[PDB]
């Protein structure tokens, strides 16, 4: 398990605002959002930006 | 042949842009390839070119020219843009050929 | 080894039907881990005015335990065996599936069955989910992309079942009864309308055995084994414009009526969508992307993103596209987009299709990357196509598509049609249905 | 057939080559590299980030144009995932086009040209790419966490700092690629192709001489506390201590202490029971929230602790509660069973996480680079359960005793300071 992840065609994009910058209201739409482990970063020439 | 190479230097002098202090490349009509080529020039080469041109235009408005000493000499004319222009055209042809394909 | 062959070596999908009518299917692999779940042909389209949202309210309680074992027990029993329990509910399809080690396969089935059959529906829990759901509505209300697709449906199929949201209405959630939820489960979660799907390292025979065991109840009458055909939904060329200039960017979604699962044209349509493709500001390809619309989008900064979609249903569907863009570039984007659609009906090249097919092939293969996605495919295939369609078959269909074909199919569904339009946000620059309508003809 | 093998040669220069073959209709090839933001210095910060976005730029063999139109032509893809210390350039496509797609992967990772103008036009993209990533508060606090937890290498941000946007040079890129993309630091993994071919490719092409050029200045623990007051109604917070290093002996202990405390929900909208931390928090707070065990394993260091999310006012109770649950565990509060649940909970997680061609290649690669060979899936499982009830409790103590570093975000008016725990 030396995997940096296993310890720690598709894809949807997004968009924000620059210059200065650019909802969760129940334990349900928040659970699983507490940094599993490290942070990865991806970029594809053909798909959305990824982050863990 | 090293003959027509005598022709070149002849023409170069006949043309007369060197009398304004312009380099051969400074005289290129700015079509699209040239437009792009210039955008790729290093800051310094770009500003040097800019002054040379603004200088020629001032001469042209004055109906004067540079003192013989200051004329660009055939063998000292820097073809600074040709390398870039050559590339901009290669890329374009590639894309062109690839899009018909 | 060639692509041709690898497609053949793929282990076939075994399907066997029980007595009550339930169907059992699986694709066995060498994998130690796996996924199994039940895919039900039931959703919001099956609901009515007063019970809209039941299928969703149910989806929330489907995990708060059964009668055989209350909440804490149920959860503890699932967690402590390292299995993942998840699910969903759409308009024409619901599903509850589990991810675990091939070993537990049988205990899993028992649990699946206990949920779809004995959901406790404890009343104290219902008064809690009421707030939970209400809260998820306010959160989902801030997701423009979804607010936009719901509006698209709400207008495209106005006055029908498909016009409803899956989560239902505020009033319904506030007043649904222990009864209604029970009634929904009883009326809808039934054997002939369900499919037990499994993918991973499991034995079909072993699987079907477990089924017979916990999927008991057999039917007496003829009505209990009849799978009801739903009243058809009427499509309407229209538009809904929700304007709020206080929102950062605009969302626009435009679409025409699709054929529905069964139709072979769906293959071509997907190839078509492959030509127009999709895009978003983090695509590294940039100005070189093969998609003409993506290219222009980059050249002229037309949008933050765009995507084409071929949402199929049993008897109908929606074929369109959706984009997000700044208030002042909506017009040009729409213009260029409708442009590309007309190009589809009139000038598609063999070059464009060759690539589209390759993109579509890779796409279908990518939908079978893991046990959960392969299980999802089986569940849906049986439920929608009444059987499984292999990659070997799909690929054949895809290889049959050519420019000529794409043109004729797109012309058939797009050319001179009255689209449905949903626009949300600072949409002033996009305007007049009439103008949008004229964009539906002349390359 | 199907029941194949996993060959794994290792050429002269030190370049590793791992391969498999599950006769999948599609192939997936990668190029794992020991290189990241960890090898940057105050002088070339962000250069690693830009290098990630620069993958589509012109190479000596293929143009910015042909790379994209070329890969798209065969329904292929090309991406670059990277952590704080590893970069992975991988492509995907149908078996028939592996050869085609390969040319570009080779070119991108070994022959970049980083033309000044291309580089210049590209830089403003760092601004955008960063802006989307930072939409998740999750990412903002992990940047500051590493910052407060270290003094160097790992303390470096994963996304190019603002002040350096537009100031990176073609130079910095070149040098960064010359001193880090060296054969002894690279591995060419590849699922879905015969090992003999993936090998033939490596040899006959790959240049950029062996060695290990620049070396990362060993990470030094700092134990800082960075707080970001930004008005958000939801406070994110992370509290950690130095933990296990990659492949460390002590590693597997925290992994288990992780699952014993709660490492991410298993039942949609369910209240994790096997999660002591969650359950412990729930008893303390009454409003919405989330809490988990945080664990990171780096080459020469590691991080461990918990991460929370809560309404600003119930921030105090949530983090203190998350703490007691760590102390209460450092005091024999770990049943012999909790250790058994977690043990399988982990083998399951690990196992499932390898159904994805991406997950698999990411596994076969991470080892083939940091190690030199592929561990047996039974060894991993054997090494995991060989963890004692004590190993776990002691890991918990290491946390309670060690110096902590924290990182908050949101309206912190009720959030506590590291010295109030």
């Amino acid at each position: 398990m030396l995997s940096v992840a296993a310890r720690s065609x598709x894809x949807x994009x997004x968009x924000x605002x620059x210059x200065x910058x650019x909802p969760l209201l129940c334990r349900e739409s928040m659970s699983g959002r507490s940094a599993r482990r490290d942070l990865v970063a991806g970029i594809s020439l053909n798909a959305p930006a990824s982050v863990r | 042949g090293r003959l027509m190479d005598r022709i070149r230097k002849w023409y170069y002098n006949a043309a007369g842009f060197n009398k304004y202090g312009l380099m051969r490349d400074d005289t290129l009509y700015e079509d699209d390839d040239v437009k792009e080529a210039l955008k790729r020039l290093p800051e310094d080469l770009y500003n040097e070119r800019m002054f040379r041109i603004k200088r020629a235009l001032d001469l042209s408005l004055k109906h004067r020219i540079l003192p013989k000493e200051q004329w660009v000499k055939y063998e000292e004319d820097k073809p600074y843009l040709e390398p870039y222009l050559k590339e901009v055209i290669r890329e374009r042809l590639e894309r062109e050929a690839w899009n018909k394909k | 080894a060639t692509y041709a062959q690898t497609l053949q070596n793929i282990p076939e999908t075994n399907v066997t039907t029980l007595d009550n009518g339930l169907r059992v299917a699986s694709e066995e692999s060498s994998q130690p881990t796996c996924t199994v779940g039940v895919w039900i042909g039931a959703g919001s389209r099956y609901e009515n005015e007063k019970n809209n949202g039941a299928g969703y309210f149910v989806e929330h309680l489907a995990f708060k335990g059964t009668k055989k074992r209350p909440c804490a027990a149920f959860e503890k029993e699932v967690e402590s065996m390292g299995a993942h329990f998840n699910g969903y509910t759409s308009r024409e399809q619901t599903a509850f599936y589990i991810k675990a080690l091939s070993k537990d396969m049988p205990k899993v089935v028992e649990l699946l069955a206990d949920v779809v059959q004995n959901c406790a529906l404890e009343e104290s829990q219902i008064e809690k989910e009421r707030g939970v759901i209400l809260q998820e509505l306010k959160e989902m209300d801030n997701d423009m992309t979804n607010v936009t697709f719901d509006y698209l449906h709400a207008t495209a199929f106005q006055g029908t079942a498909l016009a409803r949201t899956v989560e239902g209405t505020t009033e319904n959630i506030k007043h649904l009864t222990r009864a209604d939820l029970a009634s929904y489960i009883d009326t809808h979660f039934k054997a002939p309308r369900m499919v037990l799907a499994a993918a991973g390292g499991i034995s079909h025979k072993e699987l079907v055995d477990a089924a017979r065991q916990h999927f008991s109840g057999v039917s007496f009458t003829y009505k209990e084994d009849a799978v009801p055909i739903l009243p058809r939904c009427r499509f309407t060329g229209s538009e809904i414009r929700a304007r709020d200039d206080a929102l950062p960017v605009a969302h626009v979604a435009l679409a025409v009526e699709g054929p529905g699962w069964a139709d072979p044209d769906n293959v071509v349509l997907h190839v078509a969508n492959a030509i127009i493709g999709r895009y978003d500001r983090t695509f590294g390809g940039g100005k070189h992307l093969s998609s003409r619309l993506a290219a222009l989008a980059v050249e002229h900064k037309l949008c933050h993103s765009f995507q084409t979609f071929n949402t199929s249903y049993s008897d109908t569907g929606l074929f369109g596209f959706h984009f997000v863009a700044d208030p002042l570039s909506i017009d040009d984007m729409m213009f260029c987009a409708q442009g590309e659609w007309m190009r589809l009906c009139t000038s598609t090249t063999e070059s464009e299709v060759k690539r589209a097919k390759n993109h579509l092939r890779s796409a279908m293969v990518a939908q079978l990357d893991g046990t959960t996605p392969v299980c999802e495919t089986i569940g849906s295939h049986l439920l929608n196509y009444g059987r499984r369609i292999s990659l070997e078959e799909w690929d054949s269909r895809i290889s049959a598509v050519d420019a000529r074909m794409v043109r004729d199919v797109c012309s058939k569904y797009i050319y001179d049609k009255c689209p449905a339009l949903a626009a949300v946000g600072p949409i002033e620059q996009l305007l007049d249905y009439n103008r949008i309508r004229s964009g539906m003809y002349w390359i | 057939p199907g029941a194949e093998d996993l060959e794994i040669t290792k050429l002269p220069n030190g370049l590793i080559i791992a391969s498999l073959e599950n006769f999948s209709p599609a192939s997936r090839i990668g190029v794992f590299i020991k290189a990241g933001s960890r090898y940057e210095t105050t002088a070339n910060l962000g250069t690693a980030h830009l290098l990630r976005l620069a993958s589509p730029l012109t190479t000596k063999g293929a143009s910015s144009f042909r790379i994209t139109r070329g890969i798209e032509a065969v329904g292929g893809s090309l991406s670059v995932y990277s952590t704080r210390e590893k970069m992975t350039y991988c492509v995907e496509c149908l078996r028939d086009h592996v050869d085609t797609v390969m040319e570009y992967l080779l070119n991108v990772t070994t022959a970049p040209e980083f033309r000044p103008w291309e580089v210049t036009d590209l830089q403003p993209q760092l601004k955008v790419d960063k802006a989307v990533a930072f939409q998740s508060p999750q990412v903002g606090v992990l940047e500051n966490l590493h910052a407060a937890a270290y003094k160097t290498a790992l303390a470096n941000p994963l996304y190019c700092p603002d002040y350096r946007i537009g100031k990176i040079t073609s130079e910095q890129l070149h040098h960064f690629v010359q001193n880090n993309f060296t054969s002894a630091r690279m591995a060419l993994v590849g699922i879905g192709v015969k090992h003999s071919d993936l090998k033939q490719v490596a040899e006959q092409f790959l240049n950029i001489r062996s060695g290990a050029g620049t070396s990362s200045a060993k990470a030094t623990y700092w134990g800082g506390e960075i707080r970001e007051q930004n008005g958000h109604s939801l406070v994110h917070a992370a509290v950690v201590t130095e933990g296990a290093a990659v492949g460390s002996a002590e590693a597997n202990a925290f992994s288990v202490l992780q699952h014993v405390l709660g490492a991410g929900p298993l039942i949609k909208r369910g209240s994790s029971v096997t999660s002591k931390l969650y359950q412990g928090v729930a008893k303390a707070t009454t409003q919405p929230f989330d809490a988990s065990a945080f664990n990171v394993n780096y080459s020469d260091s590691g991080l461990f602790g918990f991460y929370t999310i809560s309404q600003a006012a119930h921030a105090g109770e949530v983090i203190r509660a998350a703490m007691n649950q760590l102390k209460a565990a450092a005091q024999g509060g770990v049943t012999e069973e909790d250790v058994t649940k977690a043990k399988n909970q982990l083998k399951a997680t690990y196992l499932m996480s390898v159904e994805t061609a991406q997950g698999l290649l990411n596994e076969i690669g991470s080892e083939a680079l940091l190690s030199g060979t592929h561990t047996a899936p039974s060894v991993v499982a054997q090494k995991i359960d060989s963890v004692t009830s004590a190993d776990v409790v002691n890991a918990a103590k290491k946390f309670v005793s060690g110096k902590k570093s924290m990182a908050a975000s949101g309206d912190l008016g009720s959030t506590p300071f590291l010295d109030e725990l």
Side-chain angles (χ1 to χ4, degrees), chain D residues 64 90 105 146 167 180 220 223 226 232 304 320:
Chain D
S64 181
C90 62
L105 180 55
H146 286 53
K167 294 175 183 170
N180 293 282
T220 301
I226 295 175
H232 250 62
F304 185 90
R320 294 191 171 71

mmCIF file of all heavy atoms in Angstrom, chain D residues 64 90 105 146 167 180 220 223 226 232 304 320:
data_model
loop_
_atom_site.group_PDB
_atom_site.id
_atom_site.type_symbol
_atom_site.label_atom_id
_atom_site.label_comp_id
_atom_site.label_asym_id
_atom_site.label_seq_id
_atom_site.Cartn_x
_atom_site.Cartn_y
_atom_site.Cartn_z
ATOM 1 N N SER D 64 2.453 21.406 -30.074
ATOM 2 C CA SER D 64 1.343 21.635 -29.154
ATOM 3 C C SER D 64 0.054 21.205 -29.844
ATOM 4 O O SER D 64 -0.875 20.682 -29.219
ATOM 5 C CB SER D 64 1.272 23.126 -28.808
ATOM 6 O OG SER D 64 0.228 23.400 -27.896
ATOM 7 N N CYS D 90 0.031 10.075 -17.292
ATOM 8 C CA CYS D 90 -0.550 8.864 -17.855
ATOM 9 C C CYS D 90 -1.521 9.148 -18.994
ATOM 10 O O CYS D 90 -2.185 10.188 -19.033
ATOM 11 C CB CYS D 90 -1.237 8.031 -16.769
ATOM 12 S SG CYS D 90 -2.603 8.854 -15.970
ATOM 13 N N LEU D 105 3.392 10.656 -24.972
ATOM 14 C CA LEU D 105 3.763 10.512 -23.566
ATOM 15 C C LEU D 105 5.279 10.639 -23.458
ATOM 16 O O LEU D 105 5.803 11.347 -22.596
ATOM 17 C CB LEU D 105 3.311 9.153 -23.027
ATOM 18 C CG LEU D 105 3.625 8.833 -21.559
ATOM 19 C CD1 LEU D 105 3.077 9.924 -20.647
ATOM 20 C CD2 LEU D 105 3.025 7.472 -21.190
ATOM 21 N N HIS D 146 0.147 21.778 6.040
ATOM 22 C CA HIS D 146 1.533 21.451 5.715
ATOM 23 C C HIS D 146 2.453 22.618 6.027
ATOM 24 O O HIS D 146 3.579 22.430 6.479
ATOM 25 C CB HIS D 146 1.679 21.098 4.243
ATOM 26 C CG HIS D 146 1.133 19.754 3.894
ATOM 27 N ND1 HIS D 146 -0.150 19.367 4.215
ATOM 28 C CD2 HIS D 146 1.684 18.716 3.225
ATOM 29 C CE1 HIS D 146 -0.366 18.148 3.755
ATOM 30 N NE2 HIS D 146 0.731 17.731 3.150
ATOM 31 N N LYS D 167 5.815 34.893 -13.072
ATOM 32 C CA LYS D 167 7.235 35.145 -12.852
ATOM 33 C C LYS D 167 8.115 33.912 -13.036
ATOM 34 O O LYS D 167 9.330 33.983 -12.891
ATOM 35 C CB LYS D 167 7.440 35.738 -11.461
ATOM 36 C CG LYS D 167 6.831 37.116 -11.332
ATOM 37 C CD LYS D 167 6.920 37.664 -9.920
ATOM 38 C CE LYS D 167 6.230 39.021 -9.825
ATOM 39 N NZ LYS D 167 6.098 39.483 -8.413
ATOM 40 N N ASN D 180 15.283 16.558 -12.032
ATOM 41 C CA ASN D 180 14.346 15.685 -11.334
ATOM 42 C C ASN D 180 13.777 14.560 -12.184
ATOM 43 O O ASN D 180 13.435 13.500 -11.665
ATOM 44 C CB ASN D 180 13.208 16.524 -10.736
ATOM 45 C CG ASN D 180 13.680 17.453 -9.614
ATOM 46 O OD1 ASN D 180 13.893 17.021 -8.484
ATOM 47 N ND2 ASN D 180 13.845 18.731 -9.929
ATOM 48 N N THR D 220 11.603 19.090 7.902
ATOM 49 C CA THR D 220 11.798 19.364 9.318
ATOM 50 C C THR D 220 10.485 19.771 9.979
ATOM 51 O O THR D 220 9.874 20.760 9.581
ATOM 52 C CB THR D 220 12.811 20.504 9.507
ATOM 53 O OG1 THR D 220 14.055 20.131 8.902
ATOM 54 C CG2 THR D 220 13.020 20.806 10.991
ATOM 55 N N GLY D 223 5.462 22.347 13.663
ATOM 56 C CA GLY D 223 4.388 22.358 14.636
ATOM 57 C C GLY D 223 3.883 23.774 14.813
ATOM 58 O O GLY D 223 3.980 24.367 15.893
ATOM 59 N N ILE D 226 -1.690 27.866 11.932
ATOM 60 C CA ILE D 226 -2.148 28.876 10.983
ATOM 61 C C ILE D 226 -3.677 28.967 10.983
ATOM 62 O O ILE D 226 -4.366 27.972 10.760
ATOM 63 C CB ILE D 226 -1.660 28.525 9.569
ATOM 64 C CG1 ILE D 226 -0.132 28.596 9.531
ATOM 65 C CG2 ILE D 226 -2.289 29.459 8.554
ATOM 66 C CD1 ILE D 226 0.472 28.165 8.224
ATOM 67 N N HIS D 232 -16.793 32.374 6.720
ATOM 68 C CA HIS D 232 -17.569 31.162 6.438
ATOM 69 C C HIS D 232 -18.338 30.652 7.661
ATOM 70 O O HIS D 232 -17.818 30.647 8.781
ATOM 71 C CB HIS D 232 -16.644 30.051 5.958
ATOM 72 C CG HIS D 232 -16.812 29.708 4.518
ATOM 73 N ND1 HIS D 232 -16.578 30.616 3.507
ATOM 74 C CD2 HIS D 232 -17.190 28.556 3.914
ATOM 75 C CE1 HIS D 232 -16.804 30.036 2.342
ATOM 76 N NE2 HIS D 232 -17.176 28.787 2.561
ATOM 77 N N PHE D 304 -0.556 12.933 11.021
ATOM 78 C CA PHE D 304 -1.673 12.186 11.576
ATOM 79 C C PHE D 304 -2.466 13.009 12.566
ATOM 80 O O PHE D 304 -1.915 13.799 13.323
ATOM 81 C CB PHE D 304 -1.175 10.927 12.282
ATOM 82 C CG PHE D 304 -2.278 10.038 12.768
ATOM 83 C CD1 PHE D 304 -2.783 9.036 11.953
ATOM 84 C CD2 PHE D 304 -2.830 10.223 14.032
ATOM 85 C CE1 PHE D 304 -3.829 8.224 12.387
ATOM 86 C CE2 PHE D 304 -3.878 9.418 14.481
ATOM 87 C CZ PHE D 304 -4.380 8.415 13.657
ATOM 88 N N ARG D 320 -12.787 19.811 20.816
ATOM 89 C CA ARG D 320 -12.394 19.296 22.121
ATOM 90 C C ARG D 320 -12.867 17.856 22.184
ATOM 91 O O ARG D 320 -12.127 16.966 22.599
ATOM 92 C CB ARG D 320 -13.047 20.094 23.245
ATOM 93 C CG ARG D 320 -12.555 21.520 23.319
ATOM 94 C CD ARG D 320 -13.012 22.222 24.581
ATOM 95 N NE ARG D 320 -12.339 23.508 24.720
ATOM 96 C CZ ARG D 320 -12.588 24.568 23.958
ATOM 97 N NH1 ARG D 320 -13.507 24.498 23.005
ATOM 98 N NH2 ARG D 320 -11.902 25.692 24.132
#
